[PDB]
Design a protein around this ligand. Structure first.
Ligand SMILES: [Mg+2]
Ligand SMILES: [Mg+2]
Ligand SMILES: [Mg+2]
Ligand SMILES: [Mg+2]
Ligand SMILES: [Mg+2]
Ligand SMILES: [Mg+2]
Ligand SMILES: [Mg+2]
Ligand SMILES: [Mg+2]
Ligand SMILES: [Mg+2]
Ligand SMILES: [Mg+2]
Ligand SMILES: [Mg+2]
Ligand SMILES: [Mg+2]
Ligand SMILES: [Mg+2]
Ligand SMILES: [Mg+2]
Ligand SMILES: [Mg+2]
Ligand SMILES: [Mg+2]
Ligand SMILES: [Mg+2]
Ligand SMILES: [Mg+2]
Ligand SMILES: [Mg+2]
Ligand SMILES: [Mg+2]
Ligand SMILES: [Mg+2]
Ligand SMILES: [Mg+2]
Ligand SMILES: [Mg+2]
Ligand SMILES: [Mg+2]
Ligand SMILES: [Mg+2]
Ligand SMILES: [Mg+2]
Ligand SMILES: [Mg+2]
Ligand SMILES: [Mg+2]
Ligand SMILES: [Mg+2]
Ligand SMILES: [Mg+2]
Ligand SMILES: [Mg+2]
Ligand SMILES: [Mg+2]
Ligand SMILES: [Mg+2]
Ligand SMILES: [Mg+2]
Ligand SMILES: [Mg+2]
Ligand SMILES: [Mg+2]
Ligand SMILES: [Mg+2]
Ligand SMILES: [Mg+2]
Ligand SMILES: [Mg+2]
Ligand SMILES: [Mg+2]
Ligand SMILES: [Mg+2]
Ligand SMILES: [Mg+2]
Ligand SMILES: [Mg+2]
Ligand SMILES: [Mg+2]
Ligand SMILES: [Mg+2]
Ligand SMILES: [Mg+2]
Ligand SMILES: [Mg+2]
Ligand SMILES: [Mg+2]
Ligand SMILES: [Mg+2]
Ligand SMILES: [Mg+2]
Ligand SMILES: [Mg+2]
Ligand SMILES: [Mg+2]
Ligand SMILES: [Mg+2]
Ligand SMILES: [Mg+2]
Ligand SMILES: [Mg+2]
Ligand SMILES: [Mg+2]
Ligand SMILES: [Mg+2]
Ligand SMILES: [Mg+2]
Ligand SMILES: [Mg+2]
Ligand SMILES: [Mg+2]
Ligand SMILES: [Mg+2]
Ligand SMILES: [Mg+2]
Ligand SMILES: [Mg+2]
Ligand SMILES: [Mg+2]
Ligand SMILES: [Mg+2]
Ligand SMILES: [Mg+2]
Ligand SMILES: [Mg+2]
Ligand SMILES: [Mg+2]
Ligand SMILES: [Mg+2]
Ligand SMILES: [Mg+2]
Ligand SMILES: [Mg+2]
Ligand SMILES: [Mg+2]
Ligand SMILES: [Mg+2]
Ligand SMILES: [Mg+2]
Ligand SMILES: [Mg+2]
Ligand SMILES: [Mg+2]
Ligand SMILES: [Mg+2]
Ligand SMILES: [Mg+2]
Ligand SMILES: [Mg+2]
Ligand SMILES: [Mg+2]
Ligand SMILES: [Mg+2]
Ligand SMILES: [Mg+2]
Ligand SMILES: [Mg+2]
Ligand SMILES: [Mg+2]
Ligand SMILES: [Mg+2]
Ligand SMILES: [Mg+2]
Ligand SMILES: [Mg+2]
Ligand SMILES: [Mg+2]
Ligand SMILES: [Mg+2]
Ligand SMILES: [Mg+2]
Ligand SMILES: [Mg+2]
Ligand SMILES: [Mg+2]
Ligand SMILES: [Mg+2]
Ligand SMILES: [Mg+2]
Ligand SMILES: [Mg+2]
Ligand SMILES: [Mg+2]
Ligand SMILES: [Mg+2]
Ligand SMILES: [Mg+2]
Ligand SMILES: [Mg+2]
Ligand SMILES: [Mg+2]
Ligand SMILES: [Mg+2]
Ligand SMILES: [Mg+2]
Ligand SMILES: [Mg+2]
Ligand SMILES: [Mg+2]
Ligand SMILES: [Mg+2]
Ligand SMILES: [Mg+2]
Ligand SMILES: [Mg+2]
Ligand SMILES: [Mg+2]
Ligand SMILES: [Mg+2]
Ligand SMILES: [Mg+2]
Ligand SMILES: [Mg+2]
Ligand SMILES: [Mg+2]
Ligand SMILES: [Mg+2]
Ligand SMILES: [Mg+2]
Ligand SMILES: [Mg+2]
Ligand SMILES: [Mg+2]
Ligand SMILES: [Mg+2]
Ligand SMILES: [Mg+2]
Ligand SMILES: [Mg+2]
Ligand SMILES: [Mg+2]
Ligand SMILES: [Mg+2]
Ligand SMILES: [Mg+2]
Ligand SMILES: [Mg+2]
Ligand SMILES: [Mg+2]
Ligand SMILES: [Mg+2]
Ligand SMILES: [Mg+2]
Ligand SMILES: [Mg+2]
Ligand SMILES: [Mg+2]
Ligand SMILES: [Mg+2]
Ligand SMILES: [Mg+2]
Ligand SMILES: [Mg+2]
Ligand SMILES: [Mg+2]
Ligand SMILES: [Mg+2]
Ligand SMILES: [Mg+2]
Ligand SMILES: [Mg+2]
Ligand SMILES: [Mg+2]
Ligand SMILES: [Mg+2]
Ligand SMILES: [Mg+2]
Ligand SMILES: [Mg+2]
Ligand SMILES: [Mg+2]
Ligand SMILES: [Mg+2]
Ligand SMILES: [Mg+2]
Ligand SMILES: [Mg+2]
Ligand SMILES: [Mg+2]
Ligand SMILES: [Mg+2]
Ligand SMILES: [Mg+2]
Ligand SMILES: [Mg+2]
Ligand SMILES: [Mg+2]
Ligand SMILES: [Mg+2]
Ligand SMILES: [Mg+2]
Ligand SMILES: [Mg+2]
Ligand SMILES: [Mg+2]
Ligand SMILES: [Mg+2]
Ligand SMILES: [Mg+2]
Ligand SMILES: [Mg+2]
Ligand SMILES: [Mg+2]
Ligand SMILES: [Mg+2]
Ligand SMILES: [Mg+2]
Ligand SMILES: [Mg+2]
Ligand SMILES: [Mg+2]
Ligand SMILES: [Mg+2]
Ligand SMILES: [Mg+2]
Ligand SMILES: [Mg+2]
Ligand SMILES: [Mg+2]
Ligand SMILES: [Mg+2]
Ligand SMILES: [Mg+2]
Ligand SMILES: [Mg+2]
Ligand SMILES: [Mg+2]
Ligand SMILES: [Mg+2]
Ligand SMILES: [Mg+2]
Ligand SMILES: [Mg+2]
Ligand SMILES: [Mg+2]
Ligand SMILES: [Mg+2]
Lengths: 141, 109, 150, 55, 102, 115
RNA sequence: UGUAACGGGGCUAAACCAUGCACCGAAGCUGCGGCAGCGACGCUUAUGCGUUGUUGGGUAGGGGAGCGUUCUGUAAGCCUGUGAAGGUGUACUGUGAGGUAUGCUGGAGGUAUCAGAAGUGCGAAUGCUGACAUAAGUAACGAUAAAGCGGGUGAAAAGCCC
RNA sequence: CCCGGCGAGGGGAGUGAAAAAGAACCUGAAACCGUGUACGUACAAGCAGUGGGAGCAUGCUUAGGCGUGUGACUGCGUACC
């Protein structure tokens, strides 16, 4: 009889912090993507952005198993005549440590306007300090 | 009052005359009469003559007063096209269309 | 159809659907694929079936009480006014006055009357006996029809 | 040369979006007579900058 | 106040008072129905089930209407195999007003 | 007896163009294009009455699985827990209870914990 | 042409070998309605059904039962200026072809029922005629012998007259 | 009568039952081209629909909501012959 769907205006969004120091990249990124999407909430609706705002501080200290620190490569094309650029997991952290969690979450989120909308929710950081003290972002594990 | 005036079978296509008619829309008659003096087009003279009709049309018959009058509904409709033969190279013929427009103006207040 | 057999344009070469005649039924102003011819729609009826149908319909009038059998039925002079007046007493309007001895006086006087028809006892029909709301048969006409149908 | 399949009302419109021509909205006024004209142009009667300079 | 019950081979989370459309019943237009198929009754204290159905719970309801639903069209169409089919359908329902969550 | 067919054809085209009302461009305006859209709409409609039943089950299951994990049990163990306690309540309602009455819902997760 | 040999993210367990209960998962099976085809059933009866099984994907193709259109008989009847056909909307209704009622337009024909006869239903045939789109306000305005200014008439003059 | 070039073309006024019956003249469909009102639409990928579905605009009965137009976002989805 017309089951419940989460109305955007009525969605009460929450703020969280996750310290990614010594965490496994994928196992962090998954649990982030589950939250960002709003799966954990009992009022989950696939067409509405029900998930929570997360702050992922200490992104550079994220851990990876095996030889993936050197062996794991992040390819991307420049959209140019023969422009394929690669960067290993070390080299990626040497330049842009935010990109590692970003890319690891983005692949796990859905693809489309809402998928891009629920990415915006995430807030990755290299340093331990975060300037979102205004929201009282509570600790998550 | 509304007080219509219209040029039917006006020798110009809609698309061209309709370009002028978008300048004057919801504008005061005195301001609208000026624009078409300094709009560098044929259809300006063609559209003006209908408006300048519509104002006299309005003032003599029904409404009176020139100050409070606005061009409420100007619109151009495509009229009957006259078919003509244009002979091309290699023997073949093309049927060109001498297009006409129905220009209406409505001058209300 | 009037028109030449000529191909207006040739088989190939021009970018246009292969035509062979101006008169072809898929073209305008010429053809009608399966044109009608003047034909005879009349169909055979077996004598025994025709007689059997008459015997069937003429017997059903007796059950429905349409068949008004009478003695001598004839107008005085060849005049419609009298015939129209005499059916008022008989309480009839749409009728088939069947008569053995077909009177010209009665005939002429029922030509202008629409709902009345005056057939001869020999000239009864299947459609007529069904069509009219009553059927007035003369005692001689019943005797003739009896012998005719048998 | 030649379109593969016909464009729409929509596209035709999208292209025509820039075809709309602008009005003047910038009429001058002659000092002495008070007649309207284009900037840096003479009037219908024959004035420019409040002085007669034409027959 | 709200209770749960099985009717047209399917269950309805219903409250006391509101109308409920459910699948057609062999009942008159304005008689009454008793559902002893009650699965759950919620209040200050919830009476949930460790067996099939409750125990002494009975949902009493009154039949409101006996109409038909909206016309659902059915279009079957096999591309390029010279086959298509058309079939309308209106499903029969029975509106019931709840008048006793015991 | 020649039969003109202008009255009836129009009525046939106009019927379909009424069903095509709302479609983009020619698909609303032009019979020859509309008729395909109206059929396709029917095919998709026929299909999606099947998928509506699928989607909603997933939607419920996700809600129940979400609401269960707040109380510390997974959907797979929860449903087995309910089955083993001979609970006949469906996903549709469990999902509705999960959203609305959580204090009620909590009792079902305990009822499941027994088994 | 670009990672490009897990579908991707990603994983030392989210891989593999073995066992063990879970759960998800299709139009499959069960639940509750609704319709129809054939077979039994009691023998009801000349067929409704307490029924009662069972079936019901479908190209070529074969067999059933219908809708609608113009015309002929029922009809010199019936409906119609207190508004026909047609056009255009809206609301019901049938399993479908459809049907009914009515708003506006229209301004005079229409036709129940049961029969009869067909120029009886169109999206395709590089179909045939008329109308209108697209490209597009695009190319082009037909010799690279050349125009300039003054006055004239005229609503208006690069082109006409001087 | 009035605007216009004592044009076209219109607005009146009048005739008629009616002039969106005014001679380009009964009816006046569709393609096609417009003017105004409601909603949507300038970080978003594909047969353009379809199941879900917020909001907003109007119709209603109202002290629930149910029609109607619209369709953010989202699962599935490669036209017909
Ligand atoms: Mg290089
Ligand atoms: Mg997907
Ligand atoms: Mg001219
Ligand atoms: Mg514009
Ligand atoms: Mg022009
Ligand atoms: Mg035209
Ligand atoms: Mg040439
Ligand atoms: Mg040639
Ligand atoms: Mg000839
Ligand atoms: Mg020959
Ligand atoms: Mg020859
Ligand atoms: Mg060709
Ligand atoms: Mg001819
Ligand atoms: Mg002929
Ligand atoms: Mg023919
Ligand atoms: Mg014959
Ligand atoms: Mg024959
Ligand atoms: Mg014969
Ligand atoms: Mg013979
Ligand atoms: Mg009669
Ligand atoms: Mg004879
Ligand atoms: Mg091609
Ligand atoms: Mg093509
Ligand atoms: Mg448009
Ligand atoms: Mg342009
Ligand atoms: Mg301005
Ligand atoms: Mg039963
Ligand atoms: Mg085939
Ligand atoms: Mg059909
Ligand atoms: Mg005829
Ligand atoms: Mg036709
Ligand atoms: Mg039509
Ligand atoms: Mg009609
Ligand atoms: Mg058709
Ligand atoms: Mg239509
Ligand atoms: Mg819509
Ligand atoms: Mg839409
Ligand atoms: Mg259309
Ligand atoms: Mg349309
Ligand atoms: Mg289900
Ligand atoms: Mg390559
Ligand atoms: Mg390479
Ligand atoms: Mg690959
Ligand atoms: Mg790969
Ligand atoms: Mg390769
Ligand atoms: Mg390799
Ligand atoms: Mg290789
Ligand atoms: Mg895989
Ligand atoms: Mg896998
Ligand atoms: Mg281990
Ligand atoms: Mg294996
Ligand atoms: Mg098992
Ligand atoms: Mg299923
Ligand atoms: Mg099933
Ligand atoms: Mg089945
Ligand atoms: Mg049967
Ligand atoms: Mg069996
Ligand atoms: Mg089957
Ligand atoms: Mg079959
Ligand atoms: Mg074959
Ligand atoms: Mg029948
Ligand atoms: Mg028929
Ligand atoms: Mg009929
Ligand atoms: Mg008819
Ligand atoms: Mg007839
Ligand atoms: Mg006749
Ligand atoms: Mg009769
Ligand atoms: Mg008479
Ligand atoms: Mg009668
Ligand atoms: Mg009557
Ligand atoms: Mg009468
Ligand atoms: Mg009368
Ligand atoms: Mg009248
Ligand atoms: Mg009246
Ligand atoms: Mg009336
Ligand atoms: Mg009236
Ligand atoms: Mg009627
Ligand atoms: Mg007729
Ligand atoms: Mg009719
Ligand atoms: Mg009609
Ligand atoms: Mg009516
Ligand atoms: Mg009424
Ligand atoms: Mg009527
Ligand atoms: Mg009106
Ligand atoms: Mg009218
Ligand atoms: Mg009239
Ligand atoms: Mg008349
Ligand atoms: Mg009238
Ligand atoms: Mg007549
Ligand atoms: Mg008849
Ligand atoms: Mg027949
Ligand atoms: Mg018939
Ligand atoms: Mg026949
Ligand atoms: Mg025959
Ligand atoms: Mg034919
Ligand atoms: Mg065809
Ligand atoms: Mg068709
Ligand atoms: Mg075909
Ligand atoms: Mg064709
Ligand atoms: Mg071609
Ligand atoms: Mg053609
Ligand atoms: Mg064009
Ligand atoms: Mg130009
Ligand atoms: Mg140009
Ligand atoms: Mg171009
Ligand atoms: Mg160019
Ligand atoms: Mg050029
Ligand atoms: Mg040149
Ligand atoms: Mg030249
Ligand atoms: Mg040259
Ligand atoms: Mg001189
Ligand atoms: Mg001069
Ligand atoms: Mg001089
Ligand atoms: Mg001079
Ligand atoms: Mg002069
Ligand atoms: Mg002059
Ligand atoms: Mg002048
Ligand atoms: Mg002058
Ligand atoms: Mg003069
Ligand atoms: Mg001058
Ligand atoms: Mg000169
Ligand atoms: Mg020159
Ligand atoms: Mg020159
Ligand atoms: Mg010269
Ligand atoms: Mg010369
Ligand atoms: Mg001279
Ligand atoms: Mg000269
Ligand atoms: Mg004057
Ligand atoms: Mg002149
Ligand atoms: Mg003069
Ligand atoms: Mg004068
Ligand atoms: Mg005129
Ligand atoms: Mg005149
Ligand atoms: Mg006039
Ligand atoms: Mg008058
Ligand atoms: Mg009068
Ligand atoms: Mg009068
Ligand atoms: Mg009237
Ligand atoms: Mg009128
Ligand atoms: Mg009048
Ligand atoms: Mg009038
Ligand atoms: Mg009047
Ligand atoms: Mg009219
Ligand atoms: Mg009329
Ligand atoms: Mg007039
Ligand atoms: Mg005239
Ligand atoms: Mg003329
Ligand atoms: Mg004419
Ligand atoms: Mg015309
Ligand atoms: Mg007439
Ligand atoms: Mg009309
Ligand atoms: Mg018209
Ligand atoms: Mg007309
Ligand atoms: Mg109309
Ligand atoms: Mg139209
Ligand atoms: Mg239409
Ligand atoms: Mg259009
Ligand atoms: Mg437009
Ligand atoms: Mg429009
Ligand atoms: Mg517009
Ligand atoms: Mg807007
Ligand atoms: Mg972006
Ligand atoms: Mg946007
Ligand atoms: Mg695109
Ligand atoms: Mg994509
Ligand atoms: Mg895609
Ligand atoms: Mg839809
Ligand atoms: Mg929907
Ligand atoms: Mg609202
Ligand atoms: Mg989507
Ligand atoms: Mg897919
Ligand atoms: Mg698709
Ligand atoms: Mg496909």
């Amino acid at each position: 009889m017309k089951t419940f769907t989460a109305k955007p205006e009525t969605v009460k969004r929450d703020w969280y912090v996750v310290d990614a120091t010594g965490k496994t990249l994928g196992r962090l990124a998954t649990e982030l993507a589950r939250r960002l999407r709003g799966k954990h909430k009992a009022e989950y609706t696939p067409h509405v952005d029900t998930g929570d705002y997360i702050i992922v501080l200490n992104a550079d200290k994220v851990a990876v198993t095996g030889n993936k620190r050197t062996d794991k490569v992040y390819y991307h094309h420049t959209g140019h005549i023969g422009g394929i650029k690669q960067a290993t997991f070390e080299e990626m952290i040497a330049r842009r440590p935010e990109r590692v969690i970003e890319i690891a979450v983005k692949g796990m989120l859905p693809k489309g306007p809402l998928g891009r909308a629920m990415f915006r929710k995430l807030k990755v950081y290299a340093g331990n300090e975060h300037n979102h003290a205004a929201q009282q972002p509570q600790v998550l594990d | 009052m509304e007080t219509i005036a219209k040029h039917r079978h006006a020798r110009s296509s809609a698309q061209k005359v309709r370009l002028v008619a978008d300048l004057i829309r919801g504008k005061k008659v005195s301001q609208a009469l000026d624009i078409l003096t300094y709009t560098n087009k044929k259809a300006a003279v063609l559209v003006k003559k209908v408006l300048e009709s519509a104002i006299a049309n309005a003032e003599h018959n029904d409404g009176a007063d020139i100050d409070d009058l606005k061009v409420t509904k100007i619109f151009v409709d495509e009229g009957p096209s006259m078919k003509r033969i244009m002979p091309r190279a290699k023997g073949r013929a093309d049927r060109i269309l001498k297009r006409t427009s129905h220009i209406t103006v409505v001058v209300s207040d | 159809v009037t028109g030449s057999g000529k191909k207006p344009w040739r088989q190939k070469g021009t970018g246009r659907a292969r035509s062979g005649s101006i008169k072809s039924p898929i073209w305008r102003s010429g053809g009608v694929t399966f044109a009608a011819r003047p034909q005879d729609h009349s169909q055979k009826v077996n004598k025994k079936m025709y007689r059997g149908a008459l015997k069937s319909i003429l017997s059903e009038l007796v059950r429905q009480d349409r068949l008004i059998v009478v003695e001598k039925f004839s107008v005085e002079a060849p005049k419609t006014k009298l015939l129209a007046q005499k059916l008022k007493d008989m309480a009839l309007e749409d009728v088939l006055i069947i008569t053995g001895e077909l009177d010209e006086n009665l005939f002429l006087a029922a030509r202008n009357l629409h709902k009345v028809d005056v057939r001869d006892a020999t000239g009864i029909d299947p459609v007529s006996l069904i069509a009219f709301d009553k059927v007035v048969m003369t005692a001689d006409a019943v005797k003739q029809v009896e012998e005719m149908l048998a | 040369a030649v379109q593969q399949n016909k464009p729409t009302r929509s596209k035709r419109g999208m292209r025509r979006s820039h075809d709309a021509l602008t009005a003047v909205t910038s009429l001058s006024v002659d000092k002495t007579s008070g007649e309207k004209h284009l900037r840096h142009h003479i009037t219908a009667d024959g004035y420019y900058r409040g002085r007669k300079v034409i027959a | 106040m709200y209770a749960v019950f099985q009717s047209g081979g399917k269950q309805h989370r219903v409250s006391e008072g509101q109308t409920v459309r459910l699948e057609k019943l062999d009942i008159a237009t304005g008689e009454t129905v008793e559902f002893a198929e009650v699965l759950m009754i919620a209040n200050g204290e919830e009476v949930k089930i460790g067996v099939p159905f409750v125990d002494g719970g009975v949902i009493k309801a009154e039949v409101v209407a006996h109409g038909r639903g909206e016309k659902v069209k059915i279009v079957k169409f096999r591309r390029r195999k010279h086959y298509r089919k058309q079939q309308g359908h209106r499903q029969w329902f029975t509106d019931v007003k709840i008048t006793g969550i015991s | 007896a020649r039969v003109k067919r202008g009255v009836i054809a129009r009525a046939r085209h106009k019927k379909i163009l009424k069903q095509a009302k709302g479609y983009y461009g020619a698909r609303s305006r032009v019979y020859r294009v509309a008729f395909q859209a109206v059929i396709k709409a029917g095919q998709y409609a026929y299909r999606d009455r099947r998928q509506r039943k699928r989607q909603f089950r997933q939607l419920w299951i996700a809600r129940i699985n979400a609401a269960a994990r707040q109380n510390g049990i997974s959907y797979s163990k929860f449903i087995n827990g309910l089955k083993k306690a001979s609970v006949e309540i469906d996903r549709k309602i469990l999902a509705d209870i999960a959203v609305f009455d959580k204090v009620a819902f909590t009792a079902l997760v305990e009822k499941a914990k027994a088994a």
